[PDB]
Amino acid sequence: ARGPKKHLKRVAAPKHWMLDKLTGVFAPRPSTGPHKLRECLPLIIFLRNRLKYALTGDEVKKICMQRFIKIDGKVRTDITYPAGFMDVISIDKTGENFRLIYDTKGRFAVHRITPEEAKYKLCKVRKIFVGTKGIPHLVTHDARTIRYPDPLIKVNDTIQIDLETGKITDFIKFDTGNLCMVTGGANLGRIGVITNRERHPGSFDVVHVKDANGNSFATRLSNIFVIGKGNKPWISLPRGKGIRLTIAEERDKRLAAKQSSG
Amino acid sequence: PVARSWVCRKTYVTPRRPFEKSRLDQELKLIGEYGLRNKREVWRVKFTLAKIRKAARELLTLDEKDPRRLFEGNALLRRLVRIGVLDEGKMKLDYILGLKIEDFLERRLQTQVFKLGLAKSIHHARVLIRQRHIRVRKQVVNIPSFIVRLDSQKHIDFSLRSPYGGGRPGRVKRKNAKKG
Amino acid sequence: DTVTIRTRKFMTNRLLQRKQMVIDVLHPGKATVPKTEIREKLAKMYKTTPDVIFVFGFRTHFGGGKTTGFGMIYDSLDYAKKNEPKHRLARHGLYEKKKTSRKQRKERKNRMKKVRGTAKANVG
RNA sequence: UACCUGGUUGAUCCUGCCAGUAGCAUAUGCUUGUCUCAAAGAUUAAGCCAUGCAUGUCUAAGUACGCACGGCCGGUACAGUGAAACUGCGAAUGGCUCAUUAAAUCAGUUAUGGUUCCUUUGGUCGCUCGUACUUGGAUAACUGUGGUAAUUCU
RNA sequence: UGGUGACUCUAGAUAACCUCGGGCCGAUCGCACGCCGGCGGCGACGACCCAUUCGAACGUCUGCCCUAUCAACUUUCGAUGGUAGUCGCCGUGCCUACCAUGGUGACCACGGGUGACGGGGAAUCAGGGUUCGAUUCCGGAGAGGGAGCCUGAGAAACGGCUACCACAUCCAAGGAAGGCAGCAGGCGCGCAAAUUACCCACUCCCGACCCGGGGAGGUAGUGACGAAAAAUAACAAUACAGGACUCUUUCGAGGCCCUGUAAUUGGAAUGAGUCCACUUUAAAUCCUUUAACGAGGAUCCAUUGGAGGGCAAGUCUGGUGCCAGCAGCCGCGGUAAUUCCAGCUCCAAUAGCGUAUA
RNA sequence: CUCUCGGCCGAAGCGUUUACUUUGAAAAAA
RNA sequence: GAAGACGGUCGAACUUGACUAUCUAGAGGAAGUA
């Protein structure tokens, strides 16, 4: 190419958007924004493919252009605006609030939350620097910078934002015994307790996580998001509790849902 | 770049020996017992069993407690039991190797129409299906190679918009009534 | 009187100001029911007027019994004029597309790139 | 479905190939009722190309003294809709082809603590101790006079 | 102060400098209107720098087909390295100056070829393999051949410009214009490949933008490349010097069950068609749904190859007479041809089936 | 297989160095 | 602040050689091919 690309073919779109083959050649191609385009939901896919409020992209244009969608407390008229992990999508007209949280199969769930919960979110601090007359700074996982954080906040911690002010209320430290969600790789969407972290210098660290049923899995350090302190999550968790069932017991649950219902 | 899909697949395989007596005789017997159109209809059913047996030949080589053998070995048995080719009590993975062509050819809709007393030969049944006289629970089926499942078997009838069922009489009876 | 209307996947869309649903049509002996007859049938189910409801995309199944389409039922008529594709407004006579073709517009666009300011409007 | 069969001799057993056999791709021949999906100027010539089209774009929110149309009610800076033109952005994406190219391209893996980055998103934007209740000159559109056989010329 | 596995990092402190081809420190626009002449609420457009996003670009390690009738190559004119610079967005022989004489190779360097763009993948397949991948996804390259640039965040851009080379257009002979390996279309080339059609309704992209545009893309057309389903008849009653089944020693008797090469009899059932209407769609078509019509030699007619062997199926009949021809191979044909040319019958696959080549 | 601290165990070393084997995570969609 | 000029650089192309390759016009002939 002679410059940056603007299209996305539909087959090369991310798998967890769950687009299908035959409706078009192109995928929505997210705008640049706070989240990575392999790691986001564009607002057009959330609003007609997940919520079924629209049937075309033209109707998503009509819904968004009435200024009806607030993502993290601000109105977005962009239909390909990249919403991402733990963003609060709040539709005021229908009185719904949503948070984007991965399912146990690594896709964003349609997780409804109460408007008490819709005033905060958790972020993961990715960078700390001191800049220009000794003012300390944060950089979170969704491109927020915060001036003057608490000096105990370090890289890989998890802070809590109030969505109106933008300021930190409190935070969790990165330690063994805290609760996780995996935000990357094979183990994506799983939830458990930190038990170990082995440090390889010059390369990626590996964190071992233990499930609520005693299953254990590793990730890398960058695929780790500290949800809660100890065992209590600071947010509401989706339908499955981050416990990935095997295919045999998922089949057993799906068959037990048919011999009882009907 | 078009928004199409080019996935397709052949349903039959031609035999390696083109003129082999005692293959021709056996396949002609299988045609005559079931009223098939040509030899490709026989080779189509040889192809599905050869894939089912290849799928069970590889599960039988894995460890007896392996998760793939326990998971895909139980889905493969469930489908054969469901379409009536296996028995319920025969749900071990080794009885798949004791399945035959005629066990699948019994479960065509054409033979079920003949065997349920709706027709009076295996050739009256195909010609009954093809001109829209047979339904399965609500739905008129045109297809003679419709593999009937074991629960959708007693719901086979005469398709209420047909002269043999609900009965507006046909084009020929109507004209003969108009004539005299 | 032998036709029936059912509604499966109902949802009140507050954003586009409509109710939207899947319509099941049961015409066990006749042809496919016309779109105006389904709107008369649906408006007395949902206690409205047929000019505010818009049904489309019906496919009769093989065998001939059932038909499945989609419908939308708007709050007002002006909401229907605002939030609709214009090809469905044109199916009720509430919109008229201009009748020029597309090869005429492209050749007229290219003929007036050869011309500076106010003579562009004098291009035939 | 882990497969062979004809052919050297008067007859035999071999070596050994030739020929047969089945698929799959391009062409071609003869034939063709129904219906679903569907490749399609790659191979020779990255040869040559009539004609048409394929890239443009305005919101409440950069600039309206075109009566172009209407329109206040008529001192009423500018009601409004608005072609044109200036300004801004896009035209570096997409589409096509496979000529070149043999540690090159490319793939997996790593790195930028050795760089640049329109845009989006967040931060920053009285941190500087030294006519403003608003500054200056132009130029299009428009009006008018033209040149050239001829251009999206001027 | 803070950080990294590691800084010559970040932050701090001091002395200055700060490019006229100047660095930031707002002379910009809308809406709602106001509170006590001042103080104002939402936006929009901006803007140095920092971070983020989309990238890009340079590097790391391992991996490629044939060729020795290619055995030494590289170093003059940078080859390998050192020091200092120049240029670059930056690291670096990238370039320059001065030094050192290095660097690669039978573990195949260097050179040549490729009917070579690379992968994901495809066909075939006991297991191992062998061959293909121009081609819708990703990456690269190139817009006749080379070269040079402008603008810009991004281009050595070609539906931008400037030359040369090769072609080629208009001319009043002075001059002017060009680039289909985009969509169609034409010529050529060939064994070899479709419409100068409709639309932005879908999928998305761009713009100042809910509004405009899009031969991207969608929709039809041509389409036996190829893949899936699936008609060309079914039934009954007669008749058979049929057949088998129960009795009869056997004849011969049965509604006992099947068969037919019966243009035997019989009305029953249907689609192919013709064709209203709806539905479909941007508008249409197609399919699906339904009216009415639509079958007896149901002439509403199934073909392509074969019939000695390999290899399923006629040493039946006439013609030919080593001729004409057949035959992948062995062979057939010379007056009785199981093999040619035909009739009849039979075999195989069947809306498909031969031939050529990889 | 062990040494100092942090809470009898971890942080600090590995044990000569590899091949091998099993695991884990990382590996675009189609 | 335009034309223009000295110089430098990048550098298509042009001419003359040398080597090498191909397409074409080309007398003569030979052998095998039958």
PDB file of N, CA and C (backbone and C1' of nucleotides) in Angstrom, chain E residues 95-127:
ATOM      1  P     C E  95      26.859   2.888  -0.274  1.00  0.00           P
ATOM      2  O5'   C E  95      27.323   4.401  -0.215  1.00  0.00           O
ATOM      3  C5'   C E  95      27.133   5.274  -1.315  1.00  0.00           C
ATOM      4  C4'   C E  95      27.444   6.696  -0.931  1.00  0.00           C
ATOM      5  C3'   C E  95      28.907   7.022  -0.713  1.00  0.00           C
ATOM      6  O3'   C E  95      29.599   7.306  -1.908  1.00  0.00           O
ATOM      7  C1'   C E  95      27.638   7.860   1.087  1.00  0.00           C
ATOM      8  P     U E  96      31.152   6.949  -2.025  1.00  0.00           P
ATOM      9  O5'   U E  96      31.880   8.046  -1.136  1.00  0.00           O
ATOM     10  C5'   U E  96      31.909   9.405  -1.538  1.00  0.00           C
ATOM     11  C4'   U E  96      32.549  10.287  -0.496  1.00  0.00           C
ATOM     12  C3'   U E  96      33.962   9.934  -0.081  1.00  0.00           C
ATOM     13  O3'   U E  96      34.926  10.401  -1.004  1.00  0.00           O
ATOM     14  C1'   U E  96      32.667  10.461   1.826  1.00  0.00           C
ATOM     15  P     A E  97      36.333   9.653  -1.166  1.00  0.00           P
ATOM     16  O5'   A E  97      37.128  10.020   0.158  1.00  0.00           O
ATOM     17  C5'   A E  97      37.565  11.348   0.395  1.00  0.00           C
ATOM     18  C4'   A E  97      38.151  11.496   1.769  1.00  0.00           C
ATOM     19  C3'   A E  97      39.211  10.489   2.150  1.00  0.00           C
ATOM     20  O3'   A E  97      40.470  10.810   1.601  1.00  0.00           O
ATOM     21  C1'   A E  97      37.703  10.772   3.941  1.00  0.00           C
ATOM     22  P     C E  98      41.463   9.651   1.129  1.00  0.00           P
ATOM     23  O5'   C E  98      42.034   9.079   2.492  1.00  0.00           O
ATOM     24  C5'   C E  98      42.845   9.893   3.316  1.00  0.00           C
ATOM     25  C4'   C E  98      42.989   9.311   4.692  1.00  0.00           C
ATOM     26  C3'   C E  98      43.598   7.930   4.760  1.00  0.00           C
ATOM     27  O3'   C E  98      45.004   7.958   4.664  1.00  0.00           O
ATOM     28  C1'   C E  98      41.698   8.033   6.159  1.00  0.00           C
ATOM     29  P     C E  99      45.799   6.643   4.222  1.00  0.00           P
ATOM     30  O5'   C E  99      45.916   5.811   5.566  1.00  0.00           O
ATOM     31  C5'   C E  99      45.784   4.407   5.549  1.00  0.00           C
ATOM     32  C4'   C E  99      45.342   3.875   6.883  1.00  0.00           C
ATOM     33  C3'   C E  99      45.288   2.368   6.968  1.00  0.00           C
ATOM     34  O3'   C E  99      46.543   1.779   7.202  1.00  0.00           O
ATOM     35  C1'   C E  99      43.268   3.233   7.771  1.00  0.00           C
ATOM     36  P     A E 100      47.012   0.566   6.276  1.00  0.00           P
ATOM     37  O5'   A E 100      46.231  -0.680   6.877  1.00  0.00           O
ATOM     38  C5'   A E 100      46.390  -1.029   8.239  1.00  0.00           C
ATOM     39  C4'   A E 100      45.371  -2.046   8.674  1.00  0.00           C
ATOM     40  C3'   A E 100      45.248  -3.287   7.811  1.00  0.00           C
ATOM     41  O3'   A E 100      46.243  -4.253   8.090  1.00  0.00           O
ATOM     42  C1'   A E 100      43.101  -2.456   8.307  1.00  0.00           C
ATOM     43  P     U E 101      46.881  -5.125   6.903  1.00  0.00           P
ATOM     44  O5'   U E 101      45.661  -5.974   6.341  1.00  0.00           O
ATOM     45  C5'   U E 101      45.077  -7.017   7.110  1.00  0.00           C
ATOM     46  C4'   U E 101      43.944  -7.684   6.377  1.00  0.00           C
ATOM     47  C3'   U E 101      44.365  -8.574   5.209  1.00  0.00           C
ATOM     48  O3'   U E 101      43.500  -9.702   5.144  1.00  0.00           O
ATOM     49  C1'   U E 101      42.849  -6.959   4.453  1.00  0.00           C
ATOM     50  P     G E 102      43.665 -10.912   6.178  1.00  0.00           P
ATOM     51  O5'   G E 102      42.458 -10.713   7.189  1.00  0.00           O
ATOM     52  C5'   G E 102      41.166 -11.215   6.887  1.00  0.00           C
ATOM     53  C4'   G E 102      40.138 -10.118   6.830  1.00  0.00           C
ATOM     54  C3'   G E 102      38.725 -10.572   6.537  1.00  0.00           C
ATOM     55  O3'   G E 102      38.049 -11.000   7.696  1.00  0.00           O
ATOM     56  C1'   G E 102      39.280  -8.804   5.099  1.00  0.00           C
ATOM     57  P     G E 103      37.410 -12.461   7.763  1.00  0.00           P
ATOM     58  O5'   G E 103      36.139 -12.370   6.827  1.00  0.00           O
ATOM     59  C5'   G E 103      34.985 -11.668   7.241  1.00  0.00           C
ATOM     60  C4'   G E 103      33.968 -11.623   6.140  1.00  0.00           C
ATOM     61  C3'   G E 103      33.549 -12.963   5.581  1.00  0.00           C
ATOM     62  O3'   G E 103      32.593 -13.627   6.375  1.00  0.00           O
ATOM     63  C1'   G E 103      34.045 -11.524   3.812  1.00  0.00           C
ATOM     64  P     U E 104      32.616 -15.220   6.474  1.00  0.00           P
ATOM     65  O5'   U E 104      32.080 -15.698   5.064  1.00  0.00           O
ATOM     66  C5'   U E 104      30.716 -15.568   4.719  1.00  0.00           C
ATOM     67  C4'   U E 104      30.463 -16.145   3.359  1.00  0.00           C
ATOM     68  C3'   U E 104      30.850 -17.596   3.175  1.00  0.00           C
ATOM     69  O3'   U E 104      29.925 -18.506   3.723  1.00  0.00           O
ATOM     70  C1'   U E 104      31.630 -16.349   1.343  1.00  0.00           C
ATOM     71  P     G E 105      30.439 -19.886   4.344  1.00  0.00           P
ATOM     72  O5'   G E 105      30.834 -20.752   3.075  1.00  0.00           O
ATOM     73  C5'   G E 105      29.843 -21.178   2.161  1.00  0.00           C
ATOM     74  C4'   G E 105      30.438 -21.733   0.896  1.00  0.00           C
ATOM     75  C3'   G E 105      31.276 -22.980   1.040  1.00  0.00           C
ATOM     76  O3'   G E 105      30.499 -24.147   1.202  1.00  0.00           O
ATOM     77  C1'   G E 105      32.372 -21.467  -0.387  1.00  0.00           C
ATOM     78  P     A E 106      30.994 -25.308   2.181  1.00  0.00           P
ATOM     79  O5'   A E 106      30.413 -26.626   1.520  1.00  0.00           O
ATOM     80  C5'   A E 106      30.582 -26.860   0.131  1.00  0.00           C
ATOM     81  C4'   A E 106      30.350 -28.294  -0.249  1.00  0.00           C
ATOM     82  C3'   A E 106      31.205 -29.313   0.492  1.00  0.00           C
ATOM     83  O3'   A E 106      30.522 -30.563   0.539  1.00  0.00           O
ATOM     84  C1'   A E 106      31.742 -29.360  -1.791  1.00  0.00           C
ATOM     85  P     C E 107      29.791 -31.041   1.884  1.00  0.00           P
ATOM     86  O5'   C E 107      28.741 -29.892   2.165  1.00  0.00           O
ATOM     87  C5'   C E 107      27.350 -30.162   2.209  1.00  0.00           C
ATOM     88  C4'   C E 107      26.612 -29.156   3.051  1.00  0.00           C
ATOM     89  C3'   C E 107      27.089 -27.716   2.912  1.00  0.00           C
ATOM     90  O3'   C E 107      25.989 -26.799   2.909  1.00  0.00           O
ATOM     91  C1'   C E 107      27.219 -28.396   5.176  1.00  0.00           C
ATOM     92  P     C E 108      25.167 -26.447   1.568  1.00  0.00           P
ATOM     93  O5'   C E 108      25.870 -25.170   0.921  1.00  0.00           O
ATOM     94  C5'   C E 108      27.184 -25.213   0.379  1.00  0.00           C
ATOM     95  C4'   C E 108      27.249 -24.833  -1.075  1.00  0.00           C
ATOM     96  C3'   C E 108      25.929 -24.720  -1.823  1.00  0.00           C
ATOM     97  O3'   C E 108      26.068 -23.738  -2.847  1.00  0.00           O
ATOM     98  C1'   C E 108      27.241 -26.440  -2.779  1.00  0.00           C
ATOM     99  P     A E 109      24.933 -22.634  -3.089  1.00  0.00           P
ATOM    100  O5'   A E 109      25.676 -21.252  -2.848  1.00  0.00           O
ATOM    101  C5'   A E 109      25.907 -20.767  -1.538  1.00  0.00           C
ATOM    102  C4'   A E 109      27.191 -19.990  -1.460  1.00  0.00           C
ATOM    103  C3'   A E 109      27.379 -18.903  -2.497  1.00  0.00           C
ATOM    104  O3'   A E 109      26.693 -17.703  -2.181  1.00  0.00           O
ATOM    105  C1'   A E 109      29.339 -20.190  -2.352  1.00  0.00           C
ATOM    106  P     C E 110      25.782 -16.967  -3.280  1.00  0.00           P
ATOM    107  O5'   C E 110      26.744 -16.741  -4.516  1.00  0.00           O
ATOM    108  C5'   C E 110      27.646 -15.657  -4.584  1.00  0.00           C
ATOM    109  C4'   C E 110      28.509 -15.788  -5.804  1.00  0.00           C
ATOM    110  C3'   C E 110      27.777 -15.770  -7.133  1.00  0.00           C
ATOM    111  O3'   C E 110      27.437 -14.479  -7.587  1.00  0.00           O
ATOM    112  C1'   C E 110      29.268 -17.580  -7.107  1.00  0.00           C
ATOM    113  P     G E 111      26.016 -14.240  -8.275  1.00  0.00           P
ATOM    114  O5'   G E 111      26.076 -15.115  -9.599  1.00  0.00           O
ATOM    115  C5'   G E 111      26.880 -14.723 -10.697  1.00  0.00           C
ATOM    116  C4'   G E 111      26.917 -15.779 -11.772  1.00  0.00           C
ATOM    117  C3'   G E 111      25.596 -16.139 -12.409  1.00  0.00           C
ATOM    118  O3'   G E 111      25.109 -15.181 -13.323  1.00  0.00           O
ATOM    119  C1'   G E 111      26.781 -18.104 -11.951  1.00  0.00           C
ATOM    120  P     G E 112      23.540 -14.864 -13.350  1.00  0.00           P
ATOM    121  O5'   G E 112      22.919 -16.107 -14.115  1.00  0.00           O
ATOM    122  C5'   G E 112      23.292 -16.378 -15.450  1.00  0.00           C
ATOM    123  C4'   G E 112      22.944 -17.780 -15.867  1.00  0.00           C
ATOM    124  C3'   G E 112      21.477 -18.133 -15.907  1.00  0.00           C
ATOM    125  O3'   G E 112      20.792 -17.585 -17.015  1.00  0.00           O
ATOM    126  C1'   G E 112      22.648 -19.881 -14.889  1.00  0.00           C
ATOM    127  P     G E 113      19.308 -17.015 -16.827  1.00  0.00           P
ATOM    128  O5'   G E 113      18.401 -18.315 -16.797  1.00  0.00           O
ATOM    129  C5'   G E 113      18.390 -19.212 -17.892  1.00  0.00           C
ATOM    130  C4'   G E 113      17.816 -20.547 -17.503  1.00  0.00           C
ATOM    131  C3'   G E 113      16.353 -20.557 -17.114  1.00  0.00           C
ATOM    132  O3'   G E 113      15.487 -20.545 -18.230  1.00  0.00           O
ATOM    133  C1'   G E 113      17.586 -21.829 -15.566  1.00  0.00           C
ATOM    134  P     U E 114      14.202 -19.591 -18.245  1.00  0.00           P
ATOM    135  O5'   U E 114      13.175 -20.309 -17.280  1.00  0.00           O
ATOM    136  C5'   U E 114      12.786 -21.650 -17.489  1.00  0.00           C
ATOM    137  C4'   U E 114      12.133 -22.198 -16.253  1.00  0.00           C
ATOM    138  C3'   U E 114      10.991 -21.372 -15.706  1.00  0.00           C
ATOM    139  O3'   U E 114       9.778 -21.600 -16.402  1.00  0.00           O
ATOM    140  C1'   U E 114      12.419 -22.032 -13.940  1.00  0.00           C
ATOM    141  P     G E 115       9.051 -20.416 -17.212  1.00  0.00           P
ATOM    142  O5'   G E 115       7.571 -20.421 -16.633  1.00  0.00           O
ATOM    143  C5'   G E 115       6.436 -20.325 -17.479  1.00  0.00           C
ATOM    144  C4'   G E 115       5.778 -21.665 -17.693  1.00  0.00           C
ATOM    145  C3'   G E 115       6.359 -22.836 -16.909  1.00  0.00           C
ATOM    146  O3'   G E 115       5.750 -22.973 -15.633  1.00  0.00           O
ATOM    147  C1'   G E 115       6.060 -23.424 -19.207  1.00  0.00           C
ATOM    148  P     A E 116       6.609 -22.852 -14.285  1.00  0.00           P
ATOM    149  O5'   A E 116       6.559 -21.304 -13.944  1.00  0.00           O
ATOM    150  C5'   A E 116       7.689 -20.631 -13.421  1.00  0.00           C
ATOM    151  C4'   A E 116       7.511 -20.303 -11.974  1.00  0.00           C
ATOM    152  C3'   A E 116       6.950 -18.940 -11.665  1.00  0.00           C
ATOM    153  O3'   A E 116       5.553 -18.895 -11.898  1.00  0.00           O
ATOM    154  C1'   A E 116       8.728 -19.435 -10.190  1.00  0.00           C
ATOM    155  P     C E 117       4.769 -17.507 -12.002  1.00  0.00           P
ATOM    156  O5'   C E 117       4.574 -17.114 -10.481  1.00  0.00           O
ATOM    157  C5'   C E 117       4.485 -15.774 -10.089  1.00  0.00           C
ATOM    158  C4'   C E 117       5.284 -15.476  -8.853  1.00  0.00           C
ATOM    159  C3'   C E 117       4.901 -16.225  -7.584  1.00  0.00           C
ATOM    160  O3'   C E 117       5.484 -17.507  -7.429  1.00  0.00           O
ATOM    161  C1'   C E 117       4.898 -13.921  -7.141  1.00  0.00           C
ATOM    162  P     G E 118       4.768 -18.626  -6.520  1.00  0.00           P
ATOM    163  O5'   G E 118       5.057 -18.215  -5.021  1.00  0.00           O
ATOM    164  C5'   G E 118       6.364 -18.138  -4.493  1.00  0.00           C
ATOM    165  C4'   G E 118       6.321 -17.739  -3.048  1.00  0.00           C
ATOM    166  C3'   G E 118       5.348 -18.518  -2.208  1.00  0.00           C
ATOM    167  O3'   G E 118       5.845 -19.786  -1.856  1.00  0.00           O
ATOM    168  C1'   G E 118       5.096 -16.235  -1.741  1.00  0.00           C
ATOM    169  P     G E 119       4.836 -20.940  -1.435  1.00  0.00           P
ATOM    170  O5'   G E 119       4.577 -20.601   0.081  1.00  0.00           O
ATOM    171  C5'   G E 119       3.483 -21.143   0.757  1.00  0.00           C
ATOM    172  C4'   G E 119       3.008 -20.218   1.833  1.00  0.00           C
ATOM    173  C3'   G E 119       1.641 -20.551   2.357  1.00  0.00           C
ATOM    174  O3'   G E 119       1.669 -21.606   3.283  1.00  0.00           O
ATOM    175  C1'   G E 119       1.722 -18.271   1.881  1.00  0.00           C
ATOM    176  P     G E 120       0.840 -22.925   2.972  1.00  0.00           P
ATOM    177  O5'   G E 120      -0.566 -22.621   3.626  1.00  0.00           O
ATOM    178  C5'   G E 120      -0.628 -21.987   4.889  1.00  0.00           C
ATOM    179  C4'   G E 120      -1.911 -21.241   5.070  1.00  0.00           C
ATOM    180  C3'   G E 120      -3.166 -22.033   4.823  1.00  0.00           C
ATOM    181  O3'   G E 120      -3.477 -22.891   5.899  1.00  0.00           O
ATOM    182  C1'   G E 120      -3.358 -19.914   3.825  1.00  0.00           C
ATOM    183  P     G E 121      -3.924 -24.399   5.626  1.00  0.00           P
ATOM    184  O5'   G E 121      -5.224 -24.220   4.744  1.00  0.00           O
ATOM    185  C5'   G E 121      -5.573 -25.144   3.740  1.00  0.00           C
ATOM    186  C4'   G E 121      -5.920 -24.439   2.461  1.00  0.00           C
ATOM    187  C3'   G E 121      -6.241 -25.351   1.298  1.00  0.00           C
ATOM    188  O3'   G E 121      -7.589 -25.763   1.295  1.00  0.00           O
ATOM    189  C1'   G E 121      -4.617 -23.808   0.623  1.00  0.00           C
ATOM    190  P     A E 122      -7.963 -27.295   1.030  1.00  0.00           P
ATOM    191  O5'   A E 122      -7.641 -27.517  -0.505  1.00  0.00           O
ATOM    192  C5'   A E 122      -8.459 -26.955  -1.511  1.00  0.00           C
ATOM    193  C4'   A E 122      -8.031 -27.420  -2.870  1.00  0.00           C
ATOM    194  C3'   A E 122      -8.031 -28.919  -3.096  1.00  0.00           C
ATOM    195  O3'   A E 122      -9.304 -29.434  -3.405  1.00  0.00           O
ATOM    196  C1'   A E 122      -6.003 -28.025  -3.851  1.00  0.00           C
ATOM    197  P     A E 123      -9.714 -30.889  -2.896  1.00  0.00           P
ATOM    198  O5'   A E 123      -9.081 -31.872  -3.962  1.00  0.00           O
ATOM    199  C5'   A E 123      -9.497 -31.875  -5.313  1.00  0.00           C
ATOM    200  C4'   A E 123      -8.503 -32.608  -6.168  1.00  0.00           C
ATOM    201  C3'   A E 123      -8.250 -34.055  -5.804  1.00  0.00           C
ATOM    202  O3'   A E 123      -9.243 -34.940  -6.276  1.00  0.00           O
ATOM    203  C1'   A E 123      -6.196 -32.977  -6.164  1.00  0.00           C
ATOM    204  P     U E 124      -9.704 -36.173  -5.367  1.00  0.00           P
ATOM    205  O5'   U E 124      -8.456 -37.156  -5.389  1.00  0.00           O
ATOM    206  C5'   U E 124      -8.041 -37.798  -6.580  1.00  0.00           C
ATOM    207  C4'   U E 124      -6.681 -38.419  -6.416  1.00  0.00           C
ATOM    208  C3'   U E 124      -6.525 -39.419  -5.287  1.00  0.00           C
ATOM    209  O3'   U E 124      -7.017 -40.709  -5.586  1.00  0.00           O
ATOM    210  C1'   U E 124      -4.738 -37.899  -5.221  1.00  0.00           C
ATOM    211  P     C E 125      -7.733 -41.578  -4.444  1.00  0.00           P
ATOM    212  O5'   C E 125      -6.586 -41.882  -3.391  1.00  0.00           O
ATOM    213  C5'   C E 125      -5.534 -42.774  -3.713  1.00  0.00           C
ATOM    214  C4'   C E 125      -4.503 -42.835  -2.621  1.00  0.00           C
ATOM    215  C3'   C E 125      -5.024 -43.155  -1.229  1.00  0.00           C
ATOM    216  O3'   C E 125      -5.549 -44.455  -0.968  1.00  0.00           O
ATOM    217  C1'   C E 125      -3.600 -41.310  -1.068  1.00  0.00           C
ATOM    218  P     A E 126      -4.729 -45.824  -1.063  1.00  0.00           P
ATOM    219  O5'   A E 126      -4.528 -46.228   0.454  1.00  0.00           O
ATOM    220  C5'   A E 126      -5.322 -45.679   1.490  1.00  0.00           C
ATOM    221  C4'   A E 126      -4.980 -46.337   2.792  1.00  0.00           C
ATOM    222  C3'   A E 126      -3.885 -45.668   3.599  1.00  0.00           C
ATOM    223  O3'   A E 126      -4.425 -44.681   4.458  1.00  0.00           O
ATOM    224  C1'   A E 126      -3.455 -47.996   3.408  1.00  0.00           C
ATOM    225  P     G E 127      -3.688 -43.289   4.733  1.00  0.00           P
ATOM    226  O5'   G E 127      -2.296 -43.702   5.361  1.00  0.00           O
ATOM    227  C5'   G E 127      -2.194 -44.194   6.685  1.00  0.00           C
ATOM    228  C4'   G E 127      -0.805 -44.700   6.948  1.00  0.00           C
ATOM    229  C3'   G E 127       0.313 -43.806   6.463  1.00  0.00           C
ATOM    230  O3'   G E 127       0.568 -42.682   7.286  1.00  0.00           O
ATOM    231  C1'   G E 127       0.745 -45.992   5.764  1.00  0.00           C
TER     232        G E 127
END
